[PDB]
Point group: D2
Chain length 452, copies 4
């Protein structure tokens, strides 16, 4: 009967999407985990695929009516293996996980018993919550509730994974699973050394490639599939797809375990219910694109842009964690500047520069992020080049100077006092912020943005 | 160059068109399925997908969340409004990725590993996420991480066995009792669940996934009058995007601050970045959920199911519990001389899509004794009571064809039935075609929502 | 060098031991778990066997110097088997458990994983703490901390194990281990029924015979070894041995498990260190006696004496749980007598009769036990026969009468109002308690007490 | 009928007399052994064994325990005085049946299942009860119900690597850190342990099983100055009966009432009836432990061990950590070119009883590269420093025989061959061994 378009069915939600669309258009989106997915992905995601229940696997379902859903799921699997240059007799893939966090949890449920041991990169050193996180007070991450996690750390003087200390701690702790891959690690991973450490204790070895999956597909970074047993990823970051997840696994037995059975059973019936076939349609689209020469070019540009930005930030005298980057991000250490990342993040956000505060090695308190994380994928997608990334670094720097100036004016010491002060109409640096914003937007609006 | 899907990926475009077709010309009777709206689809296929927004509105871990926050706030208040809830008494988290993670997040919030849980037994119409163990394996993640024990229907009445639940709860001492089901054809006695829960100091939760739209429109009783926590999928009877929600009391329950424990279990506990495109779609469906049209829809859903239920009875089918108060029937096929698996397959060949389902009394999990049939999806397309009677007839014809096919197969292993019916010399293909003709003739008289 | 005897080395301890010896002598010891062990047992226990570390098993020890400890432990093992008429090719035994509770915990450790499911007789219905016990509000026994226990119960009227209900709850609960055996149960156990119920869920089946081991060995009660997988026991109580434990196990695989290796490994290196070879010495000695015609005699006397007492109590109109007993104990339901076990136990204690207050099926309050448990083995060891046990029944009866009269004089229903009443100098029933005590000590002091 | 043991059971009588003769004539050098007194054996071999006393003094299940209560109370106040403890600040539970259950009761009292524990690694002289896992199995029950990770010695010094424990404790976040060990020749830096425990909010426990007598006599440092909980065996250094004790602060520790928790874990948590015969002997041994004579014996323990160590140095053996502060030495036998397993059997055949013990640096933990040797037992019998120098020579002689025995063999085949040409040298060693030992008294009944 009536089936209005959005602008008619819900004018308020329509208006919100248009405001977000305009914010994306005019901003420098520098969140390392964000990207702009294509019109074609969004169209697959916003289709009738959302209507189908298809619990199980292709050909192996608990409902009728899944002929076309099976075709899509098979295609998406083939494309996943193709994008990562994988032999299908050696590697399988499950494309049903709903996001990165549940793809990881499904792996643990597949190969680990409750309270089995896991090692991942420490959260304050650039790791991800889903690999484990405990404070003195509480088990924060669900992974640390259901499993026993102990982190490994960077060498704080170099910003590089302290592989020698991991060698020793692994031997004492006896993890059943060692996880490589990170949220805010600016260097490539020594997969061979992980393999040697994992073998020293008979551990399973996994790479979580959520941040760098597109770079790996394009052969810009080293291939984790040469060394690891299991690879997890999100589909929304460097891969530039819909919000979702994937798990890849060896098909030959690993420590006597059939990883394919274990992982497919953990995803379903273990942890999830019906697959989101709309998300799978978008994933298939992005995985086609991931095989193209343009994508390889794009990913090489991501790294070149991040290098141009890193080099300019160094020229503005910023300290980078690890001294630089091999990938799509940099982590800036703002302690020498004398300001935290939460204050910087806000000022920059007010000038249309969106990044995130990020902890830094050496931070005294997790409640106070000492740095900022900046990535090139999103703005690279829009067509910015090396020179424009140098300008981004200059605009970031203007914003930090403004952050420092605004800090000096605030009475109270809480972040909430800063936020109230800087958002107040009578904020004295309103002109400096509006001036910066105009420059930020003048750059951003020169470029196209993908999407519907 | 940012091509449309037809140009960017014609192979995926083609598959989507085939599925649009299949939906158009089939009778979709899966009780958990529905056809979501064009407006929901437009929201889900928007630029909201691009944003990382960990945390909660105005308490985020990233910059740039002004409009994302507006949306999530609007989504929450529409959630509460759609269920007629006072926001001083009830809170909501709209970020869960689906039904299964909503439920796992609640367990994570209020239980410790190995704590005791009771939920409706899987073969008596329950859900895996509420606990399932066979003799030799813990199948559900709920039964890996927690200690589960089911409760059951009374097989003579097809109604939940409240008297037995009262007794088993007393012995097992669950910390959490879960009401709600996937294939239960009646309303739930919330007052009796509350009494049983209080009898052991257990948390009490309702999983309203299948029935949330009927509860919203006040067609079934209100769980929120009695339980502590309500979970749901945003798909199914709510007719939204694929996602989930968790509602909770704000007054402390057995001393626990449920708002804090639940929000923290969702993030940072179990999930990362919220799916804001899904949250957009959810907001759209929650607006619609408050409309008089949606109320009309939900009453039609019940009337359509009852019309189908009666005609199956006229064809002498046994229904679990003798009928239905809601959107579904569970057909006990044992007295028709055939299992659900054989029937599901033949019906699917005829463009009638439903599912095989366990029936209480089944001597074996591996042979489902019934089929579950639902009205929401075809009701959304505009079918009425007479049309549901015709559906009942077509199912009957299909079950007759299934019996005839079973007669011709040596093994009566299932794989044998399948090979037989799928072979090109399958001798009943004309009967399946003839049925299929009648099925599509009906379905293709009706519009279907979406982009 | 001055290695004095106890009288000189430690006069205070010597004096305490002597006072205890005299208390034992002038008292009627009717606690059903108690006995008087022999002089020969006490000599082995108080020997230089205490000096040796012998971690491991015979011929497979971590230390040197164990030729003679080996001989002893090998001999203890073959006497344990022989006393229970066990074929060594079907049954093995570990004689190192430090007591009854460590014996049971070693079995759990052997055959279960943490949080596995166990069913045992409910503590308020006469089971033991070590088989599982939880209040609404806490996990009291170690077994309920480390494992998931659910009790089964007696029938409220018959006094008997409600086998039918156990059939149904084990079906639902799916325990991995079912434990038969009780601390305060007056009937023999239907072992064939426990086997059927066990098999219906694939559970291991265990008997804890601590209270009845002597009766089983003398073939007075039915043989659990015909039907169960594992039997545990204390070496004290019914066996009249030193304070220790043993575990017996099938040597054929049970549900795919090698119990011998599992159980032995659990005991050592799992849970215990150096065996207490002095105690194994005393155990060997009691097991020789356990095979003797005099022990078989004594055990039939234990049952006859308990029946004599029971019958005389029924003449005095007392109600017995299950209307009687097939074993060494009787459980008196005092609810129809109008008084509880705690008031009765206390009066009886004031008159040198030691028994214990006991919960009865139906009791409203765990704080107010409705009964008393009475046992014959200790006094039967001293040489009492049936006519003496009939006299014991009359002495108890007089104590109940005194207890009733004391209750009627105290206005409180508060138990400490009762205690204050009975302990006051002006306590009106002082001469009645003195009179009863005279008769009690007059009976008791006619019989010897074994020991050094 | 109630015969004596020689009449009741001649075969057990005969075995006990053989074991008595073996103890009398041998050099008993197992570091964990001692010879307890006639007075302890008499208390342990008493009517005390008959009584059920579930609970605590005045707080029992059953009646008839007036004398059992008096006994336990006295035992507790002797335990506090033997270790110079203020009873307002410290309590003790004297019911644990041995060292292993004492420890497990502490874990049960203060930890939840799967909570984290760190103790000295087993191949580095630790104890099973503190945790032990291999690649393929959780060997200790401690490692099944709880999550253990070890800490290690610095292999170049033979001392605990406190810097490494500092770092690994920060990563692993143990809820309990355990100090104390079965084969560690040095005193412990309790102040450092406290510092490390505090860095992660952990409970800190000392297991003083091997060194309690030395601590009571003030020969080694006092753990009670720094730790929350002290467990011990009562055999070993303290020279008592076979049992355990747990000491605890009575001031709240990280908001835990340790007294209530530990008492409840012992009973009703894990054990039943106390072994009052054993508490009797313990009480006797704790009176002796307060005396001037005990203090002299413990100083003699340390002097004797130093005499042996220094003679084994003259004979050019390597000692793990370069000596000892205590009652034991750990000899590194790899530079002598033979393992501890072969040496142990040959020494035992000549009536020298010690044990094979791993060395920091073993390649396979199937092959111990060393031996542990202790002075407590022979010190109790009256031996001085000259005799421990003679013991050192006798061990030396037996090692030379073990090498020559290994030379005549070409791998448990060593045990086929010895059980023989070298019988004469084994027997000649034995004669001198037994000639030294039988010159001294032995305590006991
Ligand atoms: C290595 C890794 N693995 C898994 C995930 C989880 O993905 P999800 O947010 O889709 O659950 C992330 C997300 N990472 C987000 C969270 O900060 C980011 O902005 O970096 C990740 O970095
Ligand atoms: C520190 C510590 N804690 C606990 C125990 C266990 O005491 P138990 O054997 O009485 O259980 C020991 C015994 N240790 C034995 C093990 O070989 C020994 O010979 O040293 C111990 O050394
Ligand atoms: C009661 C109930 N709860 C939770 C879920 C899980 O929803 P997800 O599949 O999105 O995780 C379901 C799905 N049940 C599937 C069906 O009835 O067909 C359900 O029926």
């Amino acid at each position: 009967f009536l089936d209005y378009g959005l602008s008619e069915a819900d004018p308020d939600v329509h208006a919100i999407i248009n405001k977000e669309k305009d914010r994306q258009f005019r901003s420098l989106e520098l969140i390392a985990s964000e990207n702009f997915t294509s019109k074609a992905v969004m169209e697959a995601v916003g289709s009738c695929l959302t209507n189908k229940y298809s619990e199980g696997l292709p050909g192996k379902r608990y409902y009728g009516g899944n002929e076309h859903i099976d075709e899509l799921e098979i295609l998406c699997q083939q494309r996943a293996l193709a994008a990562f240059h994988l032999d299908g007799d050696k590697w399988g893939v499950n494309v049903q996980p709903l996001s990165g966090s549940p793809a990881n949890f499904a792996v643990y449920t597949a190969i680990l018993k409750p309270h089995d041991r896991i090692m991942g990169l420490d959260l304050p050193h650039g790791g991800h919550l889903s690999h484990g996180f405990m404070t003195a007070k509480r088990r924060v991450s669900g992974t640390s509730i259901y499993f026993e996690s102990m982190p490994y750390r960077l060498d704080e003087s170099t910003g590089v994974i302290d592989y020698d200390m991991l060698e020793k701690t692994a031997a004492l702790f006896r993890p059943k699973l060692i996880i490589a891959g990170a949220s805010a690690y600016p260097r490539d991973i020594d997969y061979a050394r992980f393999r040697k450490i994992a073998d020293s204790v008979g551990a399973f070895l996994m790479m979580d490639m959520a941040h760098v999956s597109g770079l790996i597909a394009a052969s810009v970074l080293a291939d984790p599939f040469e060394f690891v047993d299991i690879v997890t990823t999100t589909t929304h970051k460097s891969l530039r797809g819909p919000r979702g997840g994937m798990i890849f696994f060896k098909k030959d037995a690993v420590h006597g375990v059939d990883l394919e059975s274990a992982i497919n059973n953990a995803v379903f019936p273990g942890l999830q219910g019906g697959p989101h076939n709309h998300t799978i349609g978008g994933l298939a689209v992005c995985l086609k694109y991931a095989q193209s020469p343009d994508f390889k070019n794009y990913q090489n540009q991501v790294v070149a842009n991040c290098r141009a930005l890193a080099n300019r930030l160094v020229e503005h005298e910023y300290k980078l964690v690890s001294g630089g980057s091999d990938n799509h991000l940099v982590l800036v250490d703002l302690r020498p500047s004398g300001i935290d990342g939460a204050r910087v993040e806000k000022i920059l956000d007010m000038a249309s520069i969106t990044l995130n505060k990020n902890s830094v090695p050496g931070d005294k308190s997790a409640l106070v992020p000492g740095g900022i994380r900046i990535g090139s994928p999103a703005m690279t997608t829009r067509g910015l080049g090396e020179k424009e990334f140098e300008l981004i670094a200059d605009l970031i720097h203007e914003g930090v100077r403004i952050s420092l100036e605004a800090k000096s004016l605030v009475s109270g010491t809480k972040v909430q006092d800063f936020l109230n002060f800087v958002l107040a109409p009578e904020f004295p640096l309103g002109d400096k912020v509006s001036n910066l914003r105009r420059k930020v937007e003048a750059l951003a609006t020169q470029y196209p943005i993908p999407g519907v």
